[PDB]
Design a protein around this ligand. Sequence first.
Ligand SMILES: [Ca+2]
Ligand SMILES: [Ca+2]
Lengths: 266, 273
Amino acid sequence: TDSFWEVGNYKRTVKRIDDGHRLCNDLMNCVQERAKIEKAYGQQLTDWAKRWRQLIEKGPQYGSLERAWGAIMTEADKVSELHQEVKNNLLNEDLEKVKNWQKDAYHKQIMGGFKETKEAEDGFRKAQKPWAKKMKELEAAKKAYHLACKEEKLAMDKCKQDVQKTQEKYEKVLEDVGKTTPQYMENMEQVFEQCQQFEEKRLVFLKEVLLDIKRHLNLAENSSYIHVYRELEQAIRGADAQEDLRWFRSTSGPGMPMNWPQFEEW
Amino acid sequence: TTDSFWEVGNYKRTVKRIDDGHRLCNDLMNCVQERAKIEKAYGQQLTDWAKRWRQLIEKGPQYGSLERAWGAIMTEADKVSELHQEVKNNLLNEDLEKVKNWQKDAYHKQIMGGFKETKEAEDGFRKAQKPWAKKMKELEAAKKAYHLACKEEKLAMQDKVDKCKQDVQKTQEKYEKVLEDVGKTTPQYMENMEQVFEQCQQFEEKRLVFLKEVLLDIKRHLNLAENSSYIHVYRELEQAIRGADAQEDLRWFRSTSGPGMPMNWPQFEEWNP
Ligand SMILES: [Ca+2]
Ligand SMILES: [Ca+2]
């Protein structure tokens, strides 16, 4: 009853066509939303780097340790930058890739749906029509047979002569679907198969696009990411306690020059 | 010259570095807390989006491998979020705590103001400078009185100026004497001054050595590539995607929804009842 082969149930295959277009929509929003998220994190990082760069500067921390601490603000700028690159790929490549695929792939016609949906719809309607008509008729038949046996019940007459003519109409219409069935089957097989081909393009494209996206997301492949931490670490390792102590000593402590009191005149 | 450490009072700056040290801990802790809040905001956002798209994709019409491959991206988002939630965690519960506890063992607020350790040095430096604060005011005294008798000498042009050439002798003698005494006692001043400053350097060193340790701690918590983990999540994604089979997905719709579906082709059926 639910089977493809019953009248009208080819519609699921048709519905699927409409679906693909919408599914391009869904994916495009998916990416945009993702990019928004990356954008927010890069943004919040630069704001932070900017806060702290300024607070370290203005503040009493001095020396190489001021610079080491400052370096973290340098990672936050770099990382921020990588996330903005992610956002820009997501948006400029992948979304535009999908936008383009959809545009060239579905055609709004007039009205009034996509052209690729209607072609399928018309193909199925044409493949199912003789058959659908035979199927209504075969239907009408059985009951007239289901109407001439049961009839024999009370009057049991032109009764065994009306079994013998509704039974043969029925039997003959039956014989005749038997005959139209393999064409009816060949014909469905074709529209359907043209539908698989279209859907296959879309799915093949999807798989490619997902991969594009994985790549634009994978910060941890890229050398730059691995490098910002190689570089942060060595900057901190650069800081010397003893260095800043000596610096304070000579610029602010006992190491400063003094003009020791002498004799004066005038 | 006059902003020298050696001038009276200028030991202040070494005493103030001590306080600065306390506030610098506080600055670092804010810096860290603030960083952490940012990491968690990204966590939540990813988590949110993953939840959103997991449902939209499920309730949506995409089926088969490509449903799974797509949905797999939500999975990365969850794990990346997990990772940034860990960063936040290390920042907050290890690094912010580490400094906070150090700060706690290092400075000791006194009931009525200041840190025990600031006053140590204020006192060291006062006491080391007191003898020389005197001499230095005495020297000022002599230098002044001296020029008195000296300038008093020269506004004039046995004779009249007998005293003007002698009192000079009286103070110049004293100025000269004090000047000697100063010189004679400068080394005890230096050695004492230097002694205190040395307690201060030792202190700051502790802080700086610790500061460095913590910054390194923070870097390790920040570094996502400290993580075969971070790489895993991308590997696992790519696998899930390359797993997608289009022709397999089409087969499934064929038998699920199309021609390969079962069918009771019409047969004869008797009256029965
Ligand atoms: Ca500074
Ligand atoms: Ca679905």
